[PDB]
Amino acid sequence: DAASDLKSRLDKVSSFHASFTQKVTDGSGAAVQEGQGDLWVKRPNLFNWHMTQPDESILVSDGKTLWFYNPFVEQATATWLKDATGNTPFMLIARNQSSDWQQYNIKQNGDDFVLTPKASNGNLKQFTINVGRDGTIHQFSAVEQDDQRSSYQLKSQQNGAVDAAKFTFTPPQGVTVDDQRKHPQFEK
Ligand SMILES: CCCCCCCCCCCCCCCC(=O)N[C@H](CSC[C@H](COC(=O)CCCCCCCCCCCCCCC)OC(=O)CCCCCCCCCCCCCCC)C(N)=O
């Protein structure tokens, strides 16, 4: 079925580097943003996403901490990865328990798959992925409630082209750090 076919394809890949092009389209049909950069990924939950143009930004997951680094304003935020990837198909990679796949209705047209959550209250209501029978990922998208779609076209996929340093982040000299992992709050 679509689910088994999609899992069988993604199962072929463990790590890669790829370059990406991003297109954000609003439901109006206007492409409201375009960008490019590099992605390194390593199972189960490690990634380094670096948007180089137009507005530089770095997301690094060591599998527990997600760092967001804006080099333009020299600000880095440390968050828990689990707080950013919840209610997405991230768990299909990071955990890959059979019942995780059962959260989504998955439909196939060739190398194109569409994942629709069955019982989510989240903002993301659709995912798409184009992945060849060899596990090469060509495209991915996510759709928000207002129909804003964030789409990624991957090129130059190279499996195994990652080192462990890509998945570690130490704030550079002079970078302001907001560590949201660590003043207690009074409530009515
Ligand atoms: C499909 C089958 C299973 C694959 C599942 C992958 C799920 C990816 C979700 C990533 C979580 C988002 C973290 C950003 C925080 C955020 O800002 N949240 C919300 C965002 S709301 C709007 C939108 C929504 O965000 C996105 O969907 C980003 C998509 C970009 C990734 C495209 C490459 C595809 C790679 C798939 C690889 C499979 C692995 C194969 C084997 C290794 O935001 C954006 O597009 C901008 C943010 C881009 C930053 C993405 C970098 C994460 C790449 C993670 C890929 C690693 C996958 C597993 C690791 C082994 C918010 N702002 O509230």
Residue numbers in the entry: 1 to 182, 187 to 192
Paper excerpt:
With the exception of a subset of lipoproteins that carry a transport avoidance signature and remain in the inner membrane, the majority of lipoproteins are destined for the outer membrane. Their transport is directed by the Lol system that comprises the inner membrane transporter LolCDE, the periplasmic chaperone LolA, and the outer membrane receptor LolB, itself a lipoprotein. Following maturation on the inner membrane and extraction by the LolCDE transporter, lipoproteins are passed to the chaperone LolA that carries them across the periplasm prior to insertion into the outer membrane by the LolB receptor. LolA and LolB share structural homology, both being incomplete β-barrels with a central hydrophobic cavity closed by an alpha helical lid, but perform distinct functions.
Thus, to capture a LolA–lipoprotein intermediate favorable for structural studies, we introduced a tobacco etch virus (TEV) protease cleavage site in the N-terminal region of Pal to permit targeted removal of the lipoprotein linker and globular domain. The protein complex crystallized in space group I4 with one molecule per asymmetric unit. We resolved density for the triacylated cysteine but not for the rest of the peptide chain, suggesting that LolA does not make specific interactions with the lipoprotein amino acid chain, consistent with our demonstration that transfer to LolB can occur in the absence of the lipoprotein globular domain. The three acyl chains of the ligand are inserted deeply in the U-shaped cavity of LolA with electron density compatible with 16-carbon chains, consistent with the predominant species in E. coli lipoproteins. Interestingly, two polar interactions between the carbonyl group of the R2 ester linkage and the side chains of both S150 and Y152 also stabilize the lipoprotein. Here, we show that the triacyl moiety opens the deepest part of the LolA pocket by a further 1.5-fold, increasing the cavity volume to ∼1,400 Å3.
